[PDB]
Amino acid sequence: QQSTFLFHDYETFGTHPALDRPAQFAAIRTDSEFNVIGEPEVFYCKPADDYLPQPGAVLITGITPQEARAKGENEAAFAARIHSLFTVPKTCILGYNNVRFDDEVTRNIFYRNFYDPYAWSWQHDNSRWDLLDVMRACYALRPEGINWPENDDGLPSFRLEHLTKANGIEHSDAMADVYATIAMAKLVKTRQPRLFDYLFTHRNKHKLMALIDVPQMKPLVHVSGMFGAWRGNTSWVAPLAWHPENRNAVIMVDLAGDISPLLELDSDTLRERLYTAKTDLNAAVPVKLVHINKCPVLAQANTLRPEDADRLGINRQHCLDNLKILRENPQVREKVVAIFASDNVDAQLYNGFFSDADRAAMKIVLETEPRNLPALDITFVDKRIEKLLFNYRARNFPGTLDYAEQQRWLEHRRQVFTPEFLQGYADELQMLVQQYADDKEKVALLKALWQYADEIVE
């Protein structure tokens, strides 16, 4: 059995990985050096009839709901195909911004269609990775040898099209984003192999865990989009405490920040001071969760060299200052712990995990042909599952609904498709037409979206 990377990307009908629906999935499999070792996997998901797409997304993706309905398969089958691809042993599943987006879509698709929302990402030596944090780390820590493009504002751009172009790489098609992601992996691996291999090694949570010494507050380099392009997404952090609820979250302090509010203020204050940000100027609370299960970029503090800090405008001396004050102040530790100490089922993935029995029973749901779902005797403990099961049957297999179920589906469709909603949606499209009068392909997409609301709703 051989190690493979599976590059993949979704187009969806909206920004919400749970309330919005998938439109297209695209993937290619690769060997460990990024040679293509399979055929392009590209396919559509038919949206169910209880859903209208976000106009803005269709304008981006160029994919009407009409095209996805005509060329696609119901979400059950869509889930199936992805599931196979993802569950081939020794696969590293990766993409571009996939951790904060595509993986959330994947989990919701699996959750809605009775697959384990997680197992695919760690079973049989599967893992996940996200090449966006790699590009960011590369820029932050070891930029030399690659061209780093700046947007109109003057800050670094990690949009795939700028990156490829800045580096003489043809960027043309569902497959285009995927090929660009591969080309970027190649580039970083060639120009900067030791960093690339280090990050790859540290996608794993136990290797990350090894970096974290809380009693001693070992400072680390951290590269996160939360830190902002204006410091190349980088700071020195120190771990203060483990999250008291999330077993995979550790509470870090941002050492370049202002640690005065940590010492001076109490826990209640800090809780909403951290929550309601950028309204009070009242220094920011320099504190962020790092989730060892979300491929965070972490490295021993001295991999960010003095000269590297100068490059990014990071004040090395201020950081070392804040660390020394912290260490000699362990009442901040119990303080930060204290800070952390919807009726729609589609949005309830994160209401807990399903027990062994719960999850074995959803397994039978899967094994059962749609036609025999009504005739099914099994019990459920977790209260979500009935809800998922009705929605799963109505959305994918409307033919199998009995009289009282067809009625229930209707009331559900009427519930979403209110006079308020439909008039808004119609008016949205009509304004977008005006806004984009100059952009003819959009006018046409917008109009097509109108044709679709016409048929599916009234």
Binding site: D197, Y198, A299
Partner: peptide, 4 residues
């Protein structure tokens, strides 16, 4: 000692 450094990794990269």
């Amino acid at each position: 000692d450094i990794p990269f």
